[PDB]
């Protein structure tokens, strides 16, 4: 709070953020004293590519509840650690390196949490542990090598997760125990070879995985994904496909630019409209002859 009228500009240093406050408030100047009053009048800033680099004094809002900045110049984030009514937060692409590690402890409201395309390098230890609401956390481009164990444990009513292009080399046994309501996960293009066996298998509402472009060989942590609809597994390495063969929900599927000789394994994916087979080693298609509703199958480049 602040506790005499001040100048705009002085609760905002950053010339484009108090512009925005100016705007939002219907002031004439940056230079006009405003009351605590009425910077509790603000719950919605929509500021997205306003060449923002700095949301200091943004802490004297608590009545925030939706926050567009995408595409500003963000170093830091720490002054929203303040809007404890914040139930929507982008931050994409600005230029996050780190998180300060209590920075989202008091955001229990958050639904939404879009981080993708910063450079964020590491997330701390229990980071998003008190984001109990978050059904949305974007994460994709991003510089994400590892994942701490448990930074996902209390994100249980979380429905979509994007991990995408980013540099992740592994996944922790357990990171997506939790997340029982997850319907999307997409950790395409990152550098995913070996996944320990389980790691999708309490993922019991996932409608839609994307694992294409990693290195991925071994598909077994897919075998007891029977609820899902969407597989996306182009452009890894994989030859055996027998893990597919009790999926047989799944409606869409892309296989291509793989090493698949065998496709035997889909003969009861009865459910395929949309199979995607090409740039693999692929020579005997009887298999297909049970599939009864395909739309789009793509055999290009394989030795027929």
Known sequence: ??????????????????????????????????????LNSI???????????????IQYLPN?????????????????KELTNLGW????????????????????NLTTLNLSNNQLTS??????????????????????????????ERLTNLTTLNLSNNQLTSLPQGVFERLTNLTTLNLSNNQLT??????????????????SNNGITDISALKNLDNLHTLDLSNNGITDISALKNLDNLHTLDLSNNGITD???????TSLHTLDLSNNGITDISALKNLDNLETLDLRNNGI
């Open 1 to 38: 709070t602040i506790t005499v009228s001040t100048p705009i500009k002085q609760i905002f240093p950053d010339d484009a953020f108090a512009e925005t406050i100016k705007a939002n408030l219907k002031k004439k100047s940056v230079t006009d004293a405003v009351t605590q009053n009425e």
């Open 43 to 57: 719950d919605q800033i929509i500021a997205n590519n306003s060449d923002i680099k700095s949301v200091q004094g």
């Open 64 to 80: 925030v509840r939706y926050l567009a900045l995408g595409g500003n110049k963000l170093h830091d984030i720490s002054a929203l």
């Open 89 to 108: 937060l982008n931050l994409s692409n600005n230029q996050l390196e780190t998180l300060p590690q209590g920075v989202f402890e008091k955001l229990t």
């Open 123 to 152: 997330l701390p230890q229990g980071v998003f542990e008190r984001l109990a609401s978050l059904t949305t956390l974007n994460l994709s481009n991003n510089q994400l090598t590892s994942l701490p164990q448990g930074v996902f």
């Open 194 to 211: 070996s996944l320990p066996q389980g790691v999708f298998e309490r993922l019991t509402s996932l409608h839609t995985l994307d694992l």
């Open 263 to 269: 496709i035997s394994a889909l003969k009861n994916l």
